[PDB]
Amino acid sequence: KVFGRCELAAAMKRHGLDNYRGYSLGNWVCAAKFESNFNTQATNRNTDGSTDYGILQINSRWWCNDGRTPGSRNLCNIPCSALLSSDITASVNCAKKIVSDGNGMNAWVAWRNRCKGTDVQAWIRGCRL
Numbered sequence: 114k115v116f117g118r119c120e121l122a123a124a125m126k127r128h129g130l131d132n133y134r135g136y137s138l139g140n141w142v143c144a145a146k147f148e149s150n151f152n153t154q155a156t157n158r159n160t161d162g163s164t165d166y167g168i169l170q171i172n173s174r175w176w177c178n179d180g181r182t183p184g185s186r187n188l189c190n191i192p193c194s195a196l197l198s199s200d201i202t203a204s205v206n207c208a209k210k211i212v213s214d215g216n217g218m219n220a221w222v223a224w225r226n227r228c229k230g231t232d233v234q235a236w237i238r239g240c241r242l
């Protein structure tokens with residue numbers, strides 16, 4: 114599923130991401146835009162053999178089991194395919210564990226490079242929130 118900007122904003126808010134660990138809703142929408150272009154089916158291979166899955170491009174190295182990242186962890190206790198569903202529950206719940214890990218949203222390379230220190234509020238402008 115490819116979400117609309119305000120559609121994803123509303124879903125993320127409903128799932129309790131707005132101001133989660135102090136990160137406003139705009140930060141999460143911005144991260145999703147640059148990680149996956151709002152596409153739940155997005156996948157990208159990393160150099161180390163791991164893969165990033167879903168709207169927030171969650172890594173099989175630590176967070177999910179994709180059956181092909183030998184020696185990795187499954188800290189969110191899910192198959193990586195759950196992260197590709199049209200329902201974003203699994204992605205949001207795993208993202209909450211990631212952002213709590215100690216580095217905050219810096220865990221997302223795209224957020225650090227493209228969202229951090231910018232007017233992230235613009236990502237929710239015009240939406241019926």
Ligand SMILES: O=N[O-]
Nearest residue numbers: 117118119120121
């Ligand atoms: O959900 N369309 O902005």
Ligand SMILES: O=N[O-]
Nearest residue numbers: 137138139233234
């Ligand atoms: O949720 N406004 O960044």
Ligand SMILES: O=N[O-]
Nearest residue numbers: 178179180181182
């Ligand atoms: O991602 N464990 O193969």
Ligand SMILES: O=N[O-]
Nearest residue numbers: 124199200201202
């Ligand atoms: O739960 N909204 O994908």
